[PDB]
Amino acid sequence: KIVNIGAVLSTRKHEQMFREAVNQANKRHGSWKIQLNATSVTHKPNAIQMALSVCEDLISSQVYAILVSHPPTPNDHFTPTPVSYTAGFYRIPVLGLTTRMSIYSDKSIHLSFLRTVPPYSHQSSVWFEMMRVYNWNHIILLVSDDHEGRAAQKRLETLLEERESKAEKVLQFDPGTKNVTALLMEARELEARVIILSASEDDAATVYRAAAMLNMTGSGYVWLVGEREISGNALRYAPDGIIGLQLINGKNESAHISDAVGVVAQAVHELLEKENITDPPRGCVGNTNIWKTGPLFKRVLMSSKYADGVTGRVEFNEDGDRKFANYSIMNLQNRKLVQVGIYNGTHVIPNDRKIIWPGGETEKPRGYQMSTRLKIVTIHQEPFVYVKPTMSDGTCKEEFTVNGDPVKKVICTGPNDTSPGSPRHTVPQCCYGFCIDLLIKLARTMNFTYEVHLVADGKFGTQERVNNSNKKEWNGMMGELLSGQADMIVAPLTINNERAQYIEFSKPFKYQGLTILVKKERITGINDPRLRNPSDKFIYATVKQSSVDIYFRRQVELSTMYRHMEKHNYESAAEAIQAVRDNKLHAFIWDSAVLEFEASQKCDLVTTGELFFRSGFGIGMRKDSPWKQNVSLSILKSHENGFMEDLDKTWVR
Amino acid sequence: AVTVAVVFGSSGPLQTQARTRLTSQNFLDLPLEIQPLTVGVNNTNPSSILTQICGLLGAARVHGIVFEDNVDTEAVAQLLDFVSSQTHVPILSISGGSAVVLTPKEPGSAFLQLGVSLEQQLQVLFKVLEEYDWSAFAVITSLHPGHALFLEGVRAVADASYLSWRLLDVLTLELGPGGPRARTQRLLRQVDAPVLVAYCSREEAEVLFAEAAQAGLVGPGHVWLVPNLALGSTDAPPAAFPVGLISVVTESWRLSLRQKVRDGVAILALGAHSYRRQYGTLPAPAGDCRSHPGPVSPAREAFYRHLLNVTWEGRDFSFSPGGYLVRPTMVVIALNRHRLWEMVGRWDHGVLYMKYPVWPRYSTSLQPVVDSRHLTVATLEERPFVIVESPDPGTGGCVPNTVPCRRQSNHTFSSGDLTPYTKLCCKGFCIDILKKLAKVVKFSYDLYLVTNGKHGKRVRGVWNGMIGEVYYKRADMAIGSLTINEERSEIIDFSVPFVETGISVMVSRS
Amino acid sequence: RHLTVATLEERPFVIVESPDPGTGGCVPNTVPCRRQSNHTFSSGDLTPYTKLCCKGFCIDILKKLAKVVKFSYDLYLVTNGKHGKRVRGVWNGMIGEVYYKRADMAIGSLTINEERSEIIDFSVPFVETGISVMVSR
Ligand SMILES: *[C@@H]1O[C@H](CO)[C@@H](O[C@@H]2O[C@H](CO)[C@@H](O[C@H]3O[C@H](CO)[C@@H](O)[C@H](O)[C@@H]3O)[C@H](O)[C@H]2NC(C)=O)[C@H](O)[C@H]1NC(C)=O
Ligand SMILES: *[C@@H]1O[C@H](CO)[C@@H](O[C@@H]2O[C@H](CO)[C@@H](O[C@H]3O[C@H](CO)[C@@H](O)[C@H](O)[C@@H]3O)[C@H](O)[C@H]2NC(C)=O)[C@H](O)[C@H]1NC(C)=O
Ligand SMILES: COC(=O)c1ccc([C@@H]2C(C(C)=O)=C(O)C(=O)N2CCc2c(C)[nH]c3ccccc23)cc1
Ligand SMILES: *[C@@H]1O[C@H](CO)[C@@H](O[C@@H]2O[C@H](CO)[C@@H](O)[C@H](O)[C@H]2NC(C)=O)[C@H](O)[C@H]1NC(C)=O
Ligand SMILES: *[C@@H]1O[C@H](CO)[C@@H](O[C@@H]2O[C@H](CO)[C@@H](O)[C@H](O)[C@H]2NC(C)=O)[C@H](O)[C@H]1NC(C)=O
Ligand SMILES: *[C@@H]1O[C@H](CO)[C@@H](O[C@@H]2O[C@H](CO)[C@@H](O)[C@H](O)[C@H]2NC(C)=O)[C@H](O)[C@H]1NC(C)=O
Ligand SMILES: *[C@@H]1O[C@H](CO)[C@@H](O[C@@H]2O[C@H](CO)[C@@H](O)[C@H](O)[C@H]2NC(C)=O)[C@H](O)[C@H]1NC(C)=O
Ligand SMILES: *[C@@H]1O[C@H](CO)[C@@H](O[C@@H]2O[C@H](CO)[C@@H](O)[C@H](O)[C@H]2NC(C)=O)[C@H](O)[C@H]1NC(C)=O
Ligand SMILES: *[C@@H]1O[C@H](CO)[C@@H](O)[C@H](O)[C@H]1NC(C)=O
Ligand SMILES: *[C@@H]1O[C@H](CO)[C@@H](O)[C@H](O)[C@H]1NC(C)=O
Ligand SMILES: *[C@@H]1O[C@H](CO)[C@@H](O)[C@H](O)[C@H]1NC(C)=O
Ligand SMILES: *[C@@H]1O[C@H](CO)[C@@H](O)[C@H](O)[C@H]1NC(C)=O
Ligand SMILES: *[C@@H]1O[C@H](CO)[C@@H](O)[C@H](O)[C@H]1NC(C)=O
Ligand SMILES: *[C@@H]1O[C@H](CO)[C@@H](O)[C@H](O)[C@H]1NC(C)=O
Ligand SMILES: *[C@@H]1O[C@H](CO)[C@@H](O)[C@H](O)[C@H]1NC(C)=O
Ligand SMILES: N[C@@H](CCC(=O)O)C(=O)O
């Protein structure tokens, strides 16, 4: 039983190393009557003629596997593809020795393909490790629009989902296009200072020069790149201090040849010990069937641990890519690529030298640049945020408390009255109350200035699916905060599970629940028979697109009440309270604090039943906000000493 | 006068080759009468395909290529895509085998497959589930390359849908010749689901269905939905395929090979017509197997753009940037009693049209009887216990926690002359009890109202109402406000009473 | 997926009982817990660790969290301090156990304040509380 192996190499001397390696494997693994034969051909310029020569020289023989190298002249995925098709028709495994493209790891296209060197997509994983080492959470991902960039982005995002984190934003730029500065401009406006680039060498050079022109290479910024962006024309224009990484062997053709021959020999011996091995087709012409053993040979080849390689342990993952590779972390110090670590498959260990960050800093830079100007969206809630017209000269009227102390007020910008009568301009008005005083104390404590504006549509926020939409999106304050119009929500925003998935909440600054307001006390909460038996006689509803609507929608037992309420929901709390007082609405379901304050101050109305959904109000911020901890600590301290009690006495007695 | 070459590989009968050379003077209807070329590779291997295409391109200056192949060929699509990448000739893959969508194509290629993506098939199948209200299903996938894409697609479609889908389990079985037959039978013995969605190739489908039949997973109470990959040679299905198996194909599934060739050549001719009308000149022919130019010429890029959006004989052949079809007319087919693939539903303009008001389950695997975990439940309308209402005007269907009940035909006036039913939404105490039971006992049901009688009464020896439905085997069980008495208990089997009741007298206090 | 949870008895929230020697184990709705002790009261191998059974409000919350988040856990009480107090820069109690990496998380009658929140992370408050004054009439 003679076993024949084939190879497509470049220099015709690599063929001699291939023959020497096959001789070594044939002696180390007992020859007996196994006789591992070796045949080889050289790469050809024309791809079609290369495929035809693959049929005529290698497939014509009883080849069990084909090795394929990469010519020194850069042609990217062009050169190893033809073999992968011709050998892929018959399910003959083909091992790439130096190819790095991610398209060859897609087993639906390149069926019988394996590789001894990981693709570029795996450079994301090592990046992830650094994000764990230096605790970087807010990152920008600058990937090219080609398939390789998309693969890198997908791999990094999948890694981040396990950690349950997210990239700040992803910027896909068309390959080979100039003036990507516009995209970079967006990266400048973000709060993240870490940029992870995945592009070709020319695109890397373009991005480097554009970032240099925009002062993105200064202090506080961190650049993470792969080997494509720190070699060739990219290295010359690379800004100082960037961190790239290189595979240890990478371009060592001979080491990969030896390792591949070793793994192939081991797999061949195992396969012939398995019996029922049939025979390769012996010629492309005539034979139109796949090789029956092919899938079994590939399955044996993938499940192989050749822990004797020149390049270390040789093992494959679920799609043939080399698992557990070694990377060297390189830092550009004074126009020299100094090695400042090694990624040994699972961790990165710093060994020598000192990391020089792009701004010349000698200390680890944080991955964010929290601003001082804070755009704060707020809503008009009667005991928390009073909104009043300002006087003719553009300043708030001086007013003193009943105790005799000045009332702090802020200048908000809101939509004057409802939409039809509005002149459609953000008129400046005067905002004050519980939440405004809390915000003033919080800004004084945390040392940040602010500008306050009202929510455009006057809704707290919910998820809705408009017809002919590909996805649902938050409206109101939640949509404003998620879209970026606001940086922080200072309003009676209820904390619930639906909002918490997309939004970070501070520790509650006020505990309350849900209650029912009625005119003139004949309802026993939401367990009352009339509540569960709706009729046209009894009308009850809440404010549209609020926490109460979310609460009622998510309960199957309350579905009929949800339908009845939805048929008559109101636009705002004040309108529904007025409707209740005007005998137009019988019961109003809302927050305990607002409803209790309304009943106490206005009289003529009473709250009924016990609180049936206890929660609290919290300051809403974007996910993984750097100062979420500081806001929570400040709120806890305010609760502890006296501040919340003082606010309660002053505003809502 | 564009030159279009047609490649073959379906082989089959030999005299049809004469038909191939008779294709000269039959495109007279299309504008700018086409110059056809007929070449047939009769082995379909990489060397033969490459040689045939090379000889074609070097002999005559062709404008496009129409390729048809056998259903079971896997890697031909990649070879055509590679050839189109090198020689920069717009190919058209019709028929089967090479029309299975190859989503990532080479950047410079013009493959233009005449097939439908896996995500679109998944969308149509989930529309069928929504139509018949099959919320709970189990996914069975083989180790076939692309099962990860299938799982991603089912999750994406399920998430972006209104109904609260209940994916019971996902298991990645292992099929193939002989293989490890164990551990697939064990897994198929723990599949508890009324609806099963399977992804596999033809041979793996046959193995899976033999294993499932051995595991009692066919017959009534089990519904199977598969994409086109599992089917092969729709003309003759295997004996292992269960009846009622549901798949989704394109409208050209029933068309003959001649009609498919005519449609492809028409697509090429109309694209050339639009390009010539907008540019004022005929498109330049393709190159050769020789040194390839490299950068794509603006003329080649513009001809491709005009070749994408083409409409022909009403139905449009708009092509995706990925090379497959966007918004095609889709046909939901199923295997009937006679083991023939027949049309069941249509999908035009994003709107489903099904021919069956309720899904028929006429499989004959009732040897265990217990295998049929599906029930036909009769009911009536009593205001506290069963309430009926019109379906939701917005999305049709029914409101959450409201079982869809079909009023029993229109037999009130249609005396056995009309098939269709009328959809309504049923809820109430008895319906909630039935839903609880469905979950506890793990059965599926078909709720329908009664139009003959109300509750049950012996009328000259025959029974009407719900008692009549159950007695004469038209319904497996009847639920509602059905009192237990001795007269009814002598002919049917009542259950444990779940609502106390009796005779009572009501008077006006005022 | 295995979390080490620290706690201690508080009465409305954590209640400890001895399992019945007749049945060996303890009744359902009662999670097995252990004492915070090493091999020094064992005196060999008679009883290396005290096997008790814990129930209450916080234990029910923990069981629901385990069935939802899908994690496994053990449960051990605390014998060094009760709740947490920075004594000469060293923390005892549940806060000490969590801060010094001895336990993955702590549950029970653990109040959220600033000094503890600086040192460790806190979840959302699942039951409201605060300072209250009790008098006899
Ligand atoms: C790819 O990696 C190969 C091994 O990792 C490497 O082969 C090694 O080549 C070196 C010289 O470059 C040989 O060392 C020779 O010279 C040293 C110094 O005097 C002697 O100590 C040695 O005995 C020997 O004469 C190694 O023996 C040789 N190792 C092996 C296993 O081949 C290739 O050079 C690398 N190819 C590249 C980097 O392109
Ligand atoms: C949340 O509050 C934290 C405590 O107030 C605060 O940490 C403090 O951050 C400042 C930096 O602004 C540190 O000041 C040190 O660093 C600056 C700049 O490097 C130097 O110029 C100073 O001389 C000093 O060395 C404080 O030391 C640090 N305090 C503590 C206790 O660590 C956070 O920054 C706040 N979070 C925010 C604002 O998002
Ligand atoms: C075509 O059939 C369906 O689409 C379908 C959907 C849901 C249900 C019931 C149910 C209700 C309200 O009917 C549930 O809430 C629920 O969780 N069910 C699952 C019951 C069930 C299991 C777990 N395994 C099964 C195996 C066979 C048949 C049924 C089951 C039954 C059938
Ligand atoms: C063993 O491998 C050698 C290649 O080293 C094969 O010899 C080649 O045979 C083909 C076809 O007969 C010729 O076109 C080549 O010119 C030969 N190469 C050399 C260097 O002589 C040989 O056929 C193989 N033997 C077996 C039994 O497969
Ligand atoms: C590349 O893009 C940049 C940024 O969009 C262009 O620079 C702008 O060009 C517009 C003219 O359309 C002018 O407003 C200014 O010259 C630039 N404005 C800003 C805000 O940068 C540039 O013209 C583009 N083309 C190149 C660089 O060749
Ligand atoms: C990455 O490189 C390290 C060396 O820096 C490798 O570690 C050595 O590997 C050889 C090869 O088997 C062993 O003989 C040594 O004992 C290893 N040394 C140590 C300290 O572990 C490592 O194997 C390389 N990575 C991989 C995946 O092989
Ligand atoms: C509050 O913030 C202001 C400005 O944001 C700080 O004022 C300057 O902050 C920069 C930031 O490092 C310092 O370099 C300057 O020295 C500060 N100015 C002065 C006059 O000291 C201010 O220091 C902050 N207050 C704090 C941190 O307590
Ligand atoms: C099919 O698509 C092509 C490509 O968009 C259309 O060609 C365009 O025709 C308009 C005139 O109506 C020109 O303004 C564009 O420049 C053309 N595009 C290109 C890329 O050349 C063509 O009109 C479409 N066919 C139909 C029937 O609408
Ligand atoms: C970048 O920094 C230089 C340094 O002086 C400055 O002149 C230039 O205006 C900066 N570019 C900006 C702010 O866009
Ligand atoms: C090997 O092949 C023979 C004949 O093809 C067959 O009878 C036998 O079962 C096979 N052995 C296996 C599948 O283990
Ligand atoms: C705001 O609206 C009021 C209507 O109540 C109007 O009187 C006032 O002039 C408006 N303010 C503007 C337009 O600045
Ligand atoms: C779908 O949304 C559009 C958006 O304006 C609307 O015009 C159209 O009427 C909607 N179709 C419906 C509700 O059927
Ligand atoms: C059909 O296939 C045979 C191979 O057996 C080949 O010799 C013949 O040329 C083929 N026919 C045509 C028309 O190419
Ligand atoms: C019953 O429905 C059929 C089908 O639409 C209709 O033709 C017939 O008139 C209906 N009979 C009634 C409403 O009595
Ligand atoms: C064991 O527990 C005792 C308390 O009874 C303690 O003093 C001692 O340090 C502990 N030994 C350990 C943890 O090794
Ligand atoms: N659970 C409290 C102990 C008792 C109390 O202070 O009320 C704490 O955090 O320490």
Curated annotation (Swiss-Prot), chain A:
The gene is Grin1. NMDA is probably regulated by C-terminal phosphorylation of an isoform of NR1 by PKC. Its phosphorylated state is influenced by the formation of the NMDAR-PPP2CB complex and the NMDAR channel activity. Belongs to the glutamate-gated ion channel (TC 1.A.10.1) family. NR1/GRIN1 subfamily. Disulfide bonds join C55-C284, C396-C430, C412-C431. It is a multi-pass membrane protein. Glycine binds at P492, T494, R499, S547, D591. Keywords: Calcium, Cell membrane, Disulfide bond, Glycoprotein, Ion channel, Ion transport, Ligand-gated ion channel, Magnesium, Membrane, Metal-binding, Phosphoprotein, Postsynaptic cell membrane, Receptor, Signal, Synapse, Transmembrane, Transmembrane helix, Transport, Zinc. This is Glutamate receptor ionotropic, NMDA 1. A hydrophobic region that gives rise to the prediction of a transmembrane span does not cross the membrane, but is part of a discontinuously helical region that dips into the membrane and is probably part of the pore and of the selectivity filter. It comes from the Eukaryota. The chain holds residues 25 to 794 of 938 of the full protein. GO terms for cellular component: cell surface; cytoplasm; dendrite; dendrite membrane; dendritic branch; dendritic spine; endoplasmic reticulum; endoplasmic reticulum membrane. Heterotetramer; the NMDAR subunits are modular and harbor tiered domains that function in concert to regulate opening and closing of the cation-selective ion channel pore. Forms heterotetrameric channels composed of two GluN1/zeta subunits (GRIN1), and two identical GluN2/epsilon subunits (GRIN2A, GRIN2B, GRIN2C or GRIN2D) or GluN3 subunits (GRIN3A or GRIN3B) (in vitro). Can also form heterotetrameric channels that contain at least two GluN1 subunits and at least two different GluN2 subunits (or a combination of one GluN2 and one GluN3 subunits) (in vitro).
From Swiss-Prot, chain B:
The keyword Transport applies. It is found in: Cell membrane; Postsynaptic cell membrane. Detected in cerebellum. Disulfide bonds join C54-C289, C398-C425, C405-C426. One of its GO terms (cellular component) is postsynaptic membrane. Residues 1-510 are extracellular. The keyword Membrane applies. It comes from the Eukaryota. Keywords: Calcium, Cell membrane, Disulfide bond, Glycoprotein, Ion channel, Ion transport, Ligand-gated ion channel, Magnesium, Membrane, Phosphoprotein, Postsynaptic cell membrane, Receptor, Signal, Synapse, Transmembrane, Transmembrane helix, Transport. L-glutamate binds at S481, T483, R488. GO terms for biological process: calcium ion transmembrane import into cytosol; directional locomotion; excitatory postsynaptic potential; ionotropic glutamate receptor signaling pathway; long-term synaptic potentiation; monoatomic cation transmembrane transport; negative regulation of protein catabolic process; neuromuscular process controlling balance. Glycans are attached at N42, N45, N309, N410. One of its GO terms (molecular function) is monoatomic cation channel activity. Heterotetramer. Forms heterotetrameric channels composed of two GluN1/zeta subunits (GRIN1), and two identical GluN2/epsilon subunits (GRIN2A, GRIN2B, GRIN2C or GRIN2D) or GluN3 subunits (GRIN3A or GRIN3B) (in vitro). In vivo, the subunit composition may depend on the expression levels of the different subunits. Interacts with PDZ domains of PATJ and DLG4. Interacts (via PDZ-binding motif) with SNX27 (via PDZ domain); the interaction is required for recycling to the plasma membrane when endocytosed and prevent degradation in lysosomes. Component of N-methyl-D-aspartate (NMDA) receptors (NMDARs) that function as heterotetrameric, ligand-gated cation channels with high calcium permeability and voltage-dependent block by Mg(2+). Participates in synaptic plasticity for learning and memory formation by contributing to the slow phase of excitatory postsynaptic current and long-term synaptic potentiation. Channel activation requires binding of the neurotransmitter L-glutamate to the GluN2 subunit, glycine or D-serine binding to the GluN1 subunit, plus membrane depolarization to eliminate channel inhibition by Mg(2+). A hydrophobic region that gives rise to the prediction of a transmembrane span does not cross the membrane, but is part of a discontinuously helical region that dips into the membrane and is probably part of the pore and of the selectivity filter. Belongs to the glutamate-gated ion channel (TC 1.A.10.1) family. NR2C/GRIN2C subfamily. This is Glutamate receptor ionotropic, NMDA 2C. It comes from Rattus norvegicus (Rat). The gene is Grin2c.
